[PDB]
Amino acid sequence: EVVKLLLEHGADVXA
Amino acid sequence: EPREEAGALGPAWDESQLRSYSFPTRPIPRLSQSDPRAEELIENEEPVVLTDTNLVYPALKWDLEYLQENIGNGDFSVYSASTHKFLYYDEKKMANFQNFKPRSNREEMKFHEFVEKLQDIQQRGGEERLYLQQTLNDTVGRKIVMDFLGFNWNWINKQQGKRGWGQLTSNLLLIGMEGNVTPAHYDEQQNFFAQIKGYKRCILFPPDQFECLYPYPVHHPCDRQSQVDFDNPDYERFPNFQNVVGYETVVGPGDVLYIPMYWWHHIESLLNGGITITVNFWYKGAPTPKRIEYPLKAHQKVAIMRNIEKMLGEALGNPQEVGPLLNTMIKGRYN
């Protein structure tokens, strides 16, 4: 869990 | 070294149209879409400029006259700035840094109004700068729908398949004044950057140069942008900016630049080069693999850092407590 939790990324782009 | 346009039309541009910076760089490879090396690069998430994809071949005829006549009567986001540097900011996040005075305002307008504004500014020899950046949507005219449908979906969909990427999330349409600069930042999506009108200098830095580029805090409105002013680097605050090395290129009409996820990029419209038009293609990155493999890749450590900052934000009940806690954690303990 931990690592998979810490590895997840958002999808933030640009502006 | 500048590329010679077909028909003996001289050099497309020259070095004097490039702004000058303190760091060295090396060229991003320009290759054919059919060259296996270009595939190895994309597979390895390293930048590459593809010269012959025809990704947006129908758009190569776009100019302001054509678009104004065809892009519909929807609303277009247009950014203003009193300088060549368009530092952007997340509006939602402006609550928790009230000592933050913006450098660029956003304004909604009709396309024809944006064209008028450019016309005006040139006529009156003004210095204000505009930059249109608007997601393509339903409200566009029939001719634009046809152009869009004419993009090389066969090619890019295969790329999305081979890389196990997620869905296309959007296409940003970017129309910018000569000399305009988008300062160094990174994006959390894979990007195929398709150049249409004019020339853009792109300087890229790998994820493993996080240490040299000093991003704002995650909760700051300028989250994901470098704090370093490339025109006047403060080496006392940002000492490792002295070790930065860029990958650079100039893209013109027909060129596609693969900007891999998490790679920093600094982008400028050549001085005295006219307006520029780009359309980008943003894909969500492949999923986190079932089995993690150590040592971690640099973009994965950037993922982790972002998450630590986010969680402490929630946990402490206030993002402004994040810094003090982090310093308490390391001082005399890990430094």
Ligand SMILES: O=C(O)CNC(=O)C(=O)O
């Ligand atoms: O083209 C520009 O000025 C800026 N574009 C980006 O940062 C991007 O497409 O991710």
Ligand SMILES: [Zn+2]
């Ligand atoms: Zn970007």
